[PDB]
Structures are given as C-alpha cells and as structure tokens.
C-alpha cells in the first residue's frame, strides 16, 4: 500500500491584508505515514512552523495540518511543498486565496 | 477513557 | 446526534534511527483530547483540549498506564508480524489500530470496535457483534485463533459496553459546551471563467462544527453527481471545518444552479445563488 497525499494550501479566516491570520497545509489520504512539509513564503522556506498530531482516517489513510501564524500582504506568496515516497519530485501547491 | 490491547 | 469516542494508534518501525515509534491520539467525535508519543520527553498523556483537563491528577495516572501498555504492545506486535509474514527487520512498517465505541443521543450503547491494519491494510478486526473476528489474510488468522483460545473477544465487549461508554458519558457531561455544541457554517460564493462558454461556480462552507456537512449543487431540481467537485473537509485549526462544493455550468447561466447548504447546526439550510 501506497497512497499520494492529497494537498490543501488555505488560510484558517478569510484573507485581508494586514489582517494576522493562520496559512493552513493539510495533507490527507498518504501512505507510509512518514511525509516531509515545508509552508514556503516567496518561495523561502518559513521557520519553526507547527503541525497537528499524527492521526488517520477511517480507510486507514493518514492526515496532517501543519500551519504557522501571518499576516497576508499584496505581493508575499505563499505555498506549500510537500515530499512523500510515492512522488517523483517534490510537489509544490501556491496559496490562492481567492479559489 | 483508555483500553487495552494484546499481543498478536 | 450520537456520540462516538475513539483511540487511533499508530506504530512504525525505524531501521537505521533503530527503536520504534508508538503514537496514540484520542477524539470525542470530531474533537481530539489527549495524546502519547513515545518519541516525546514526558512518557505521559497529555491534553490536547481544555475541556479534558477537569480530569484530576489520577486521571493522567492513569491514562499515561494503560496508554504505555498499548504502547509496549503493538510495538512487540511489530515484530510478531516480521515472524508471521517472514519479513526482516532491515525494512521499516506500519501498525495501526483503532479502538472505541458510539452512544445515541440519550448516552445508550450503540456500536463498539476493536480493529487493526498492518501496512495499510485490513489485519484482524472485532465484528460487530463484538463476540468474533474478521482475519484479512494467512498472518491474521494465527492471530484469530489465539485470540479466541484466550477469549479477547469476551475483554473487549467488557470493556467497550463498560468502561468506554462510562468514559464517553462522562465526557459529553463535563465537557457538553465543548462536545455537544452546533456552529453552523458561514458560507459565500465564488465564480471563475474557464472558458469562454464555461465558468466555475463554488460554493464555500467556513466554520463548522461537526465536520459532517452537505453541500449540493442541482440545475433545476436535480442532482449533478460527476459534474459537481466536493473536496475533502478541512480543519481549520481552531476547532472548526471548512469545504467547498463546485460545479461547472454553461457560462451567462449562472442562475439554473442552487447551493443548497446543510448542516446539524441549521435549523434550516440555506439557499445560495451567485
């Protein structure tokens, strides 16, 4: 059994700039449990970023959050890069706040 | 309020 | 609604790092409480919500106890399903095990379980009767006939029609503001051209709470099945989840398409149009 996570890049409120908020990656449905996430800001990987207990859904998958306080600007992008055993390449998924 | 298991 | 408490468990092994990891976190339906990590300094279970922490000093005791038994357990199990598939220790491997128990409304016993995945995968779980078990291959089978031998069967119904259900009830009492809250979502909308004769409509749902939720799109009273997108619910990471819903629809026909939201916590659900 190997499963590919799925990725979701978000914010815990709504976005206004220069509002201090919370940018979310929750990644779900991976197997093995061992997975690397990084929350990047212009694509500079951001410090001491926390996350979620280990934990796993009812068909055995597993899900992480890991996340990091911000406050949103006009020009800062953000994203999150995610390496798991069943990627080819480390994926990288960008913050759009407005999907 | 925690169970317990057994070995396999 | 109804109630459920569970303990998801979560062991792997390490060549190279050499020692194991047992993690172990607890949940009141969509809410976790404590955890253990045998990684961690404190060799303790800890709190992860206020609410739990009414509990006195005897309950961490405990708790921490049974919590490093399970833990001493499934990692000896670890190496037991190295023997049974004939598999070396030079390769990391998964054990993950899940326990607890569902009550009505009114606290009375609904369900328990009982069950394990080795890998990934189905290994031996209590059938709902909680008096047998389902073997999912050769290895667990060994295991089923042990198990029955020494009556386990027997233990965990005692312990999921008792001490589970006693715990759950306890808990929904002492933390009722907590567990048996409603907080319904807020929603909006969102639009995006994908063509010039096609556009997406979402529909968002923001801060919920249970996570259980529905959002329907329908083109005039009807279900759209693999048309409409649902993405997975998310945690919000305050205690609260957000999801959305989209549908694709034929552009300048914005209005043939409802979202028609539906939550426990709404007395009726709601109606949006873009």
């Given at each position: 059994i190997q499963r590919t996570p799925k990725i979701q890049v978000y914010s815990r409120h709504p976005a206004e700039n220069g509002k201090s908020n919370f940018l979310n990656c929750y990644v779900?449905?991976?197997?093995?449990?061992?997975?690397?996430?990084?929350?990047?800001?212009?694509?500079?990987?951001?410090?001491?970023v926390e996350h979620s207990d280990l934990s796993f859904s009812?068909?055995?998958?597993?899900?992480?959050?890991?996340?990091?306080?911000?406050?949103?600007?006009?020009?800062?992008?953000?994203?999150?890069?995610?390496?798991?055993?069943?990627?080819?390449?480390?994926?990288?998924?960008?913050?759009?706040?407005?999907? | 309020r925690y169970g317990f298991v057994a070995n396999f | 609604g109804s109630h459920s408490m569970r303990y998801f468990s979560t062991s792997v092994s390490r060549p190279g790092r050499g020692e194991p990891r047992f993690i172990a976190v607890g949940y009141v339906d969509d809410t976790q409480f404590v955890r253990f990590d045998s990684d961690a300094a404190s060799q303790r279970m800890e709190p992860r919500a206020p609410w739990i922490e009414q509990e006195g000093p005897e309950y961490?005791?405990?708790?921490?106890?049974?919590?490093?038994?399970?833990?001493?357990?499934?990692?000896?199990?670890?190496?037991?399903?190295?023997?049974?598939?004939?598999?070396?220790?030079?390769?990391?491997?998964?054990?993950?095990?899940?326990?607890?128990?569902?009550?009505?409304?009114?606290?009375?016993?609904?369900?328990?379980?009982?069950?394990?995945?080795?890998?990934?995968?189905?290994?031996?779980?209590?059938?709902?009767?909680?008096?047998?078990?389902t073997a999912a291959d050769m290895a667990a089978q060994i295991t089923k006939r042990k198990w029955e031998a020494a009556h386990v069967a027997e233990q965990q119904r005692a312990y999921l029609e008792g001490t589970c259900v006693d715990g759950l009830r306890r808990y929904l009492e002492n933390?009722?503001?907590?567990?048996?809250?409603?907080?319904?979502?807020?929603?909006?909308?969102?639009?995006?051209?994908?063509?010039?004769?096609?556009?997406?409509?979402?529909?968002?749902a923001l801060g919920?709470?249970?996570?259980?939720?529905?959002?329907?799109?329908?083109?005039?009273?009807?279900?759209?099945?693999?048309?409409?997108?649902?993405?997975?619910?998310?945690?919000?990471?305050?205690?609260?989840?957000?999801?959305?819903?989209?549908?694709?629809?034929?552009?300048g026909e914005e209005q043939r398409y409802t979202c028609h939201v539906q939550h426990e916590g709404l007395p009726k659900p709601l109606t949006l149009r873009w």
């Open positions: 779900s449905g991976f197997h093995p449990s061992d997975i690397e996430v990084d929350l990047l800001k212009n694509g500079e990987r951001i410090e001491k009812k068909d055995w998958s597993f899900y992480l959050l890991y996340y990091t306080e911000f406050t949103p600007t006009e020009k800062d992008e953000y994203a999150c890069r995610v390496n798991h055993v069943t990627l080819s390449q480390p994926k990288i998924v960008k913050w759009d706040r407005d999907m | - | 961490w005791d405990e708790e921490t106890g049974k919590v490093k038994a399970h833990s001493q357990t499934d990692r000896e199990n670890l190496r037991i399903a190295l023997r049974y598939y004939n598999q070396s220790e030079a390769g990391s491997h998964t054990l993950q095990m899940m326990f607890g128990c569902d009550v009505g409304s009114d606290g009375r016993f609904l369900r328990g379980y009982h069950q394990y995945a080795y890998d990934g995968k189905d290994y031996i779980a209590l059938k709902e009767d909680l008096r047998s078990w933390g009722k503001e907590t567990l048996q809250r409603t907080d319904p979502p807020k929603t909006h909308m969102t639009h995006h051209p994908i063509s010039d004769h096609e556009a997406t409509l979402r529909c968002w919920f709470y249970p996570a259980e939720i529905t959002l329907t799109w329908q083109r005039d009273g009807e279900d759209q099945t693999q048309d409409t997108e649902l993405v997975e619910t998310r945690p919000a990471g305050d205690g609260t989840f957000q999801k959305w819903a989209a549908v694709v629809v034929p552009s």
